[PDB]
Design a binder for this molecule. Structure first.
Ligand SMILES: CCCCCC/C=C\CCCCCCCCCC(=O)O
Ligand SMILES: CCCCCCCO[C@@H]1O[C@H](CO)[C@@H](O)[C@H](O)[C@H]1O
Ligand SMILES: CCCCCCCO[C@@H]1O[C@H](CO)[C@@H](O)[C@H](O)[C@H]1O
Length: 250
């Protein structure tokens, strides 16, 4: 179990360019501020990396698509996931990847904003709120989630397991081999509660709380998808990345 857990943690360490450890050190116990149009413009030149609100939404798309790649390599870097037929692999990622993305966002978030461009920039939460109304509504619920999520004081090794459990979910639509996936998830989850017993000896009810969070993540993606549908219907000028279009179809 703990050996299985260290192997998941190492796949995490190998596949994600930004970790919570590194994120908190940048946010400082242990970057260029974009907060308006001028600072955005200065970032788009300075730190390298239509209308303003749409341009920020495009940058959000760049970021989610990139994190999909990393999550794919993370999942593949676990053997049980790789034993599954490639069609099951795709189904699991189709429906789990935005749950994982939003869980991981928390790592790079504090109450006031979030890191972008590999820690080089900080975009303030107030600026994001100031955007046109479709595009300002989508990111704010993630902050509300993140703050409550960050209170639990999880570390990267905790996250490696949590995110494995989100992707290996036997509940997804059109899964071919449900019992096999359920079997992997159970093992991840037993590895998680045992890991938390070691890693967080004092924290009471932590395991059940992370299960509720998984359920809450399901609901966050449900609302996120609803908002994405509205942008597709009402915002006829904004492009939508084809891979993300493949995810939202149903
Ligand atoms: C100008 C700097 C803006 C940086 C924005 C990127 C930062 C974090 C990514 C989280 C964005 C929230 C999700 C927005 C939806 C993107 C499309 C999708 O995959 O659903
Ligand atoms: C190991 C690869 C073997 C090839 C089998 C792939 C065919 O399955 C397809 O898988 C897709 C999800 O991945 C579904 O969306 C499609 O409905 C389904 O037709
Ligand atoms: C890199 C992993 C992320 C990929 C997730 C995108 C999934 O899109 C789905 O791809 C299936 C395979 O062809 C199609 O059958 C489905 O209709 C489509 O919805």
């Amino acid at each position: 179990l703990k050996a299985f857990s260290k192997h998941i943690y190492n796949a995490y360490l190998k596949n994600f360019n930004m970790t919570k450890k590194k994120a908190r050190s940048i946010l400082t116990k242990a970057p260029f501020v974009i907060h308006d149009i001028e600072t955005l413009w200065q970032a788009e030149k300075g730190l390298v990396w239509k209308e303003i609100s749409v341009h920020v939404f495009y940058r959000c798309q760049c970021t989610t698509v990139e994190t999909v790649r990393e999550l794919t390599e993370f999942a593949k870097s676990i053997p049980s996931f790789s034993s599954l037929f490639l069609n099951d692999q795709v189904t699991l990622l189709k429906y789990g990847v935005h749950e994982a993305i939003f869980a991981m966002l928390a790592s790079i978030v504090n109450k006031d904003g979030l890191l972008v461009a590999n820690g080089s920039g900080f975009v303030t939460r107030e600026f994001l709120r100031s955007l046109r109304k479709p595009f300002s509504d989508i990111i704010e619920p993630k902050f509300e989630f993140a703050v409550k999520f960050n209170a639990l004081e999880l570390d990267d090794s905790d996250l490696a397991l949590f995110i494995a459990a989100i992707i290996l979910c036997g509940d997804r639509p059109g899964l071919m081999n449900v019992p096999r996936v359920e079997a992997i998830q159970d093992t991840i989850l037993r590895a998680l509660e045992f890991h938390l017993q070691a890693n967080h000896p004092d924290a009471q009810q932590l395991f059940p709380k992370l299960l509720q969070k998984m359920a809450d993540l399901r609901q966050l993606v449900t609302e996120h998808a609803q908002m994405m549908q509205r942008i597709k219907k009402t915002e006829t000028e904004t492009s939508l990345h084809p891979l993300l279009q493949e995810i939202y179809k149903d």
